[PDB]
């Protein structure tokens, strides 16, 4: 009687009510889609290396901080920044080893699940193993670089502080 | 310490009546009015249930308004 006869804010996913999802404002509004679809994972046209490079830069940058503030070396500035840098380095190398072995194990013949050729998953667009290896290399490069950029900004915090206060104009 | 509160004088009966008439003015816009029971609509539109409800809300509004005006000097 009322089952999809009135027009509500929550629609079937892709107009298909037998799919296992709903079109809610968090996965289907113009603001949510404009943000998510333009994130490097989903931005149209990008090569996998550039996607991974930007993901890594953003990720290695913030991963330095938790150990700088909370780590065992936090009582001293230099050691805290070094502990944060090597924590970001280790998490990056572990995550990229995982990306590489995911691609190695998944793409064997026709893969199973979302990377099978018949899959309709819109949220997982890296369908080839070449995409995954280019992504792994890019995430590694970008994340190690973003980690050492955050490390270099934290090491020179005394200089960056005197600069942003105009103390260098004497 | 306590919110003043006056006794009862012609000034208190005026506020309690002007607030009972505002209740009548706004209680004409209710639904299911003149609901028989007793005197089905023999109170200028309202029945006896609607008159009692309007005057009960008017007494409530009157007690609130009178104690507020007595607290702040006006009454």
């Amino acid at each position: 009687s009322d089952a999809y006869i009135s027009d509500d804010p929550i629609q079937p996913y892709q107009g298909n009510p037998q799919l296992g999802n709903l079109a809610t404002p968090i996965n289907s509004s113009n603001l949510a889609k404009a943000f998510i679809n333009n994130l490097p994972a989903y931005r149209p046209g990008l090569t996998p290396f550039l996607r991974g490079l930007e993901i890594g830069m953003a990720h290695g940058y913030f991963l330095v901080g938790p150990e700088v503030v909370f780590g065992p070396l936090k009582e001293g500035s230099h050691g805290a920044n070094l502990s944060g840098l090597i924590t970001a380095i280790y998490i990056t190398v572990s995550a990229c080893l995982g990306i590489s072995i995911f691609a190695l194990a998944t793409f064997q013949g026709d893969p199973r699940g979302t990377y099978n050729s018949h899959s309709r998953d819109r949220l997982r667009p890296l369908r080839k193993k070449e995409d995954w290896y280019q992504l792994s290399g890019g995430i590694l490069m970008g994340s190690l670089g973003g980690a050492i950029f955050a490390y270099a900004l934290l090491e020179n915090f005394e200089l960056l502080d005197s600069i942003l206060r105009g103390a260098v104009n004497v | 310490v306590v919110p003043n509160t006056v006794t009862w004088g012609p000034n208190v009966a005026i506020v309690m009546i002007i607030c009972n008439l505002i209740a009548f003015a706004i209680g004409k816009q209710v639904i299911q009015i003149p609901d028989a029971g007793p005197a089905p609509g023999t109170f200028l539109g309202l029945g006896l249930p609607a008159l009692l409800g309007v005057t009960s809300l008017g007494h409530a509004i009157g007690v609130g308004a009178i104690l507020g005006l007595a607290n702040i000097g006006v009454l």
Binding site: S162, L164, R165, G166, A167, V170 | -
Partner: protein
């Protein structure tokens, strides 16, 4: 006396980060977003 920028006001660390964000960190992303908005095709 004043060898550097100071704030004698509450949360005086906020100009230190707000002026970079508003003026030379977030503007080129905003310019890129607006450029991609005005150059997108039908």
């Amino acid at each position: 006396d004043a060898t550097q920028l100071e704030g004698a006001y509450a949360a005086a660390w906020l100009p230190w980060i707000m002026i970079p964000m508003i003026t030379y960190i977030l503007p080129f992303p905003i310019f890129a977003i607006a450029f991609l908005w005005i150059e997108r095709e039908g």
